[PDB]
Amino acid sequence: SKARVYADVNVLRPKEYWDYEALTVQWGEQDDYEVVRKVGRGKYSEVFEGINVNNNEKCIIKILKPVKKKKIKREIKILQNLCGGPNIVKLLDIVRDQHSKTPSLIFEYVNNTDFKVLYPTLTDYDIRYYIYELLKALDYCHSQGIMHRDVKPHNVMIDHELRKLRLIDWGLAEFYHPGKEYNVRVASRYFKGPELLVDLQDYDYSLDMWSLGCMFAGMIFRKEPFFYGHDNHDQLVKIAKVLGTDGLNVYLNKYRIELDPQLEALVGRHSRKPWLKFMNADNQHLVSPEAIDFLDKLLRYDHQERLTALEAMTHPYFQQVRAAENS
Numbered sequence: 384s385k386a387r388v389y390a391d392v393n394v395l396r397p398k399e400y401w402d403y404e405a406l407t408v409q410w411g412e413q414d415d416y417e418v419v420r421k422v423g424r425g426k427y428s429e430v431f432e433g434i435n436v437n438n439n440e441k442c443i444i445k446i447l448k449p450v451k452k453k454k455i456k457r458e459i460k461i462l463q464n465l466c467g468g469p470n471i472v473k474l475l476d477i478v479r480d481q482h483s484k485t486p487s488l489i490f491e492y493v494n495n496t497d498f499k500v501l502y503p504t505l506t507d508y509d510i511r512y513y514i515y516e517l518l519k520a521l522d523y524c525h526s527q528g529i530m531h532r533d534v535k536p537h538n539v540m541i542d543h544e545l546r547k548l549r550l551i552d553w554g555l556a557e558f559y560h561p562g563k564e565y566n567v568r569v570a571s572r573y574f575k576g577p578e579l580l581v582d583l584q585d586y587d588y589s590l591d592m593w594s595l596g597c598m599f600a601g602m603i604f605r606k607e608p609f610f611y612g613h614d615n616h617d618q619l620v621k622i623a624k625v626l627g628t629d630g631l632n633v634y635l636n637k638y639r640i641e642l643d644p645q646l647e648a649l650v651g652r653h654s655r656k657p658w659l660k661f662m663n664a665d666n667q668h669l670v671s672p673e674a675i676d677f678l679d680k681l682l683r684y685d686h687q688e689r690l691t692a693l694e695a696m697t698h699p700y701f702q703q704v705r706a707a708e709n710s
């Protein structure tokens with residue numbers, strides 16, 4: 384299996400561009416930067432509102448937890464190649480503690496409101512706006528030969544006052560090479576596509592589109608997370624109860640995959656559940672037939688059938704967002 388678009392990007396570019404292990408970091412002044420208050424926490428890092436002492440400018444200070452050097456160079460090389468692109472977070476400087484040598488990535492300052500508090504308040508149009516903006520980041524990165532692999536709400540920063548969006552946390556992103564076999568333990572359980580759940584390792588840019596589709600479904604149905612599994616196996620069951628098992632079997636036979644007895648017995652047999660059955664009084668103001676048509680084309684077992692970021696931006700669901708930009 385190979386990407387239907389942008390398959391040769393890295394093929395045509397200098398090795399330096401995609402070869403991140405040969406990277407040698409140029410560090411800066413740690414004391415240029417001061418912490419003011421914590422704003423985030425993760426298994427891989429801690430995040431802080433900071434100050435640049437030189438120019439008295441606000442910034443983002445991300446302090447990384449002890450981790451392998453290769454992962455940290457990868458994220459840095461990717462941030463550099465993406466710097467400047469639409470809606471992507473900007474790496475400004477890189478520093479580290481002398482004594483313990485824990486590194487810190489300094490970014491352009493970004494404002495955010497927790498999504499659990501922000502999503503309940505979003506309008507029909509807001510959702511088209513912010514998704515379009517997100518799709519512009521995704522098409523940019525894919526066009527530069529990169530997969531993000533961790534798309535989910537906590538990774539999209541939104542300053543709703545300025546209606547500015549930034550895709551963050553590039554700690555799990557990778558470069559794409561035709562035929563290459565990737566690691567399936569990427570992304571949050573709730574946002575993992577079927578390829579990651581049936582061990583199909585030669586995935587491509589379309590992984591990100593599945594995750595996007597899950598994010599979108601949670602938003603329009605006001606059910607977050609949309610597919611809510613307690614473990615990986617539970618996750619695939621939850622999906623199969625929605626898309627149906629016929630599509631699953633077709634998918635498995637085309638790539639010639641076979642599920643192990645445990646999972647297979649659990650999946651069982653289920654007829655498709657029509658998207659309309661998910662509409663209720665709590666989300667009725669968000670669900671439209673165009674949103675449904677869009678969503679339908681994103682959540683497809685077969686990664687090769689899924690819309691690209693570029694085709695997706697040309698969907699009529701976004702027709703008004705586009706017209707507002709052409710002026």
Ligand SMILES: Cc1cc(=O)oc2cc3c([N+](=O)[O-])c(O)ccc3cc12
Binds near residue numbers: 423443493553
């Ligand atoms: C502003 C902000 C709040 C928060 O809770 O988590 C963040 C995480 C960020 C990350 N991150 O990798 O997690 C960035 O790479 C950049 C900016 C970020 C900004 C925030």
